[PDB]
Symmetry: D3
Subunit: 143 residues, 6 copies
Amino acid sequence: KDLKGTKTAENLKQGFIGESMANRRYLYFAKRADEEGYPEIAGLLRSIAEGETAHAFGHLDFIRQGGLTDPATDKPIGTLEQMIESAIAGETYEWTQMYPGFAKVAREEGFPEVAEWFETLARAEKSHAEKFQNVLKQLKGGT
Amino acid sequence: KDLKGTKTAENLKQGFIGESMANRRYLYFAKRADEEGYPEIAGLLRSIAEGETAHAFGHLDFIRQGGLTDPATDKPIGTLEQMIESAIAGETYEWTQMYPGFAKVAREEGFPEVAEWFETLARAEKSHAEKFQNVLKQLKGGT
Amino acid sequence: KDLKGTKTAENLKQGFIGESMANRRYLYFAKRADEEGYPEIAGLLRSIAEGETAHAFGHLDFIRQGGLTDPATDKPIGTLEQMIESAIAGETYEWTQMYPGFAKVAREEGFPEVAEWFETLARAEKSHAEKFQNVLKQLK
Amino acid sequence: MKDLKGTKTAENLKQGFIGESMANRRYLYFAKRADEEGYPEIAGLLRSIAEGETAHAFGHLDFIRQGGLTDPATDKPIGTLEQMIESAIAGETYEWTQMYPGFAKVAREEGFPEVAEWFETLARAEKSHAEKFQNVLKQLKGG
Amino acid sequence: KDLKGTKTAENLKQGFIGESMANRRYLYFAKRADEEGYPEIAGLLRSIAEGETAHAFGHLDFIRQGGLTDPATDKPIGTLEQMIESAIAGETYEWTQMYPGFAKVAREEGFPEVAEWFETLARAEKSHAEKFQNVLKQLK
Amino acid sequence: MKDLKGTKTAENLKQGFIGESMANRRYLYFAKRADEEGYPEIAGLLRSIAEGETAHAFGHLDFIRQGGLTDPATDKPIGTLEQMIESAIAGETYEWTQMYPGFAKVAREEGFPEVAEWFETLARAEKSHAEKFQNVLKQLKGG
Ligand SMILES: [Cl-]
Ligand SMILES: [Cl-]
Ligand SMILES: [Cl-]
Ligand SMILES: [Cl-]
Ligand SMILES: [Cl-]
Ligand SMILES: [Cl-]
Ligand SMILES: [Fe+3]
Ligand SMILES: [Fe+3]
Ligand SMILES: [Fe+3]
Ligand SMILES: [Fe+3]
Ligand SMILES: [Fe+3]
Ligand SMILES: [Fe+3]
Ligand SMILES: [Fe+3]
Ligand SMILES: [Fe+3]
Ligand SMILES: [Fe+3]
Ligand SMILES: [Fe+3]
Ligand SMILES: [Fe+3]
Ligand SMILES: [Fe+3]
């Protein structure tokens, strides 16, 4: 049966989002355990984080094998070239819309240190977009 | 000013979600570059993934320093103990509600291989919850 | 002392093969532990794998010190330039002969998906050979 | 798929796995020489190509397992986690009870006492690994 | 040949300090490159850092082979048991004397947040000392 | 905060950084001995405690930078990415033009020719590092 347009397609997407966050959160928590001298706690958080990597990648396998799109971009991710095109689309959204819009709202609401951070991130994602565009030109057979 | 109840609080949350997904996606794409013999593409994806780690952790710093909750659980993450309690709450949600509910829907919709995966993940998150509960008992001064 | 023609020369080569396989096997097994929710088991597999890295590298130390060749390629691996030349030799054998031959036999025996995997790898090792060839100019 | 047992393709998957396993170890060993001598581009290329050879080795193991073939190193099944630990125990046991003590005896007879001492250190290490894996297996079977 | 009392003994110790600092510095700098969107710069910092690891480890090889002590603790580091005893010695000096003394001076000079950081580290190194003490029984 | 320049606390942050830097290197070196001998629990403890000493070193650098102090290794500022690369160039330059060639001359005079050859290999490596960092700095300033 086709996964397109099913509740299961949406559930694979939401599963991916949650697993992605769990890995990031557990590695961030491990640095607090590190500073305070809890190596066994830090090691458990890092080992469980590898479990959450495996879960995230398995969600993406069912997504890709089912012909579903990338949770982050709604672009196909069947081939390497499509994977780089998904990277470019996400970076482009972040520097041309998401982070400048967040920075404007942070300045309006009275949070200039947060706005400066969002402005730093917009410049970073613009750089990432350009580096991925240069890879895509080489994959397609150019300089 | 207090970040609680602001558009900027919500934007930090959404920024964290996107950065988490970007790191997972780029490491997954790097394994396709690896198999096909593109070490420079794989290396770029892994180096840009470190950038997305830095971005995710900086969002969590502004969240924690502002007294906002964990994007994944809506629990506080100021202290190590609160961080482990956030881990336990997320694992508990996944094995007692999220993954069993996804498995039931996958079976109803005619996707038994996806349901078996969700059932495997529910058993994994139950194990993770128990391991974190054992750490929390030790942090609080017990065996 | 010179290891040429001894049983110990062959035993170091077989030791290197087994230690290389053990690291790869234990990291593969760790991913199964990861998905199923066994973080202590996965962490032990990963720490024991570091032991098998140390074992493999020490066999290569004795091979090089005893004037023996690279177990994979039968080329000398004394200097960094020699090491990159051994890498190029192995990659060239794999893309020009080994993987295409594996793919032909897999097609003949009725394993079409395994044949396509061998063809993907033949293309990959050609790419690896190119990248190594383009750094030789740094080593003279 | 057809059964792989007894075919030349079965033998080729095993030899492929051996060569890929050696390539990763060789390239990481070479990278440490490039590190000490001041060639960071070459070192990073060796490390990225080594990730390629990991992907290749793991893909060979995927086909081996999916076609009901045994572990190239031990001739034991590797379908379940318990079977994977039993294969680790069988390999460690062969190494400390037969392979390394036999190698050490021959090294001493042939006039290589420092190589014999190395093989004796390795036999003690694999004995220790075997005991640690046997303790894990007991925990797995006990729930 | 015995390095005791030579200028080369002291030079190996200063080499080890500088190489240790260089690895930490370059990985810290890499995180700034990461946040700002410079993946080529971050990757070069990380690869050069691997070079400084190889340099530090080779200085420790010559220190141990020449019968010298651990640069950090002045304890021998020949055997694994000695290595864990050196770790315990350093951790014990840091929690019983060094970090509490740093915290007292920081309070005296008017740096309250830096004092609290030194106190967090004194507690951390006490924990490290305990964990190492509890593995000694494995080494006899 | 008060200015840190010229205080004992400034000197203590520098010595703290030196000790933390050595602890990480020492513990990773010890872990390789535990690896070869068959002590994976001890090896993993050394590796996890080493992550603790990374967190400690980086926190010392945070206070150093935030209080306008210079890099402990070079006495150069490390506030911006460009300053961080200039500090890397100054340290590499000192090492290949003064420190390692002087060490090599003394080793040869004192009868340690293999130690002298090592110091000469290191001088060539740091020369190579200095050139690679100078190329990065040129790219940074040029946009
Ligand atoms: Cl702990
Ligand atoms: Cl490439
Ligand atoms: Cl477990
Ligand atoms: Cl290079
Ligand atoms: Cl860059
Ligand atoms: Cl152990
Ligand atoms: Fe999970
Ligand atoms: Fe990005
Ligand atoms: Fe980002
Ligand atoms: Fe979990
Ligand atoms: Fe081994
Ligand atoms: Fe290759
Ligand atoms: Fe390969
Ligand atoms: Fe073993
Ligand atoms: Fe160095
Ligand atoms: Fe410590
Ligand atoms: Fe410390
Ligand atoms: Fe350097």
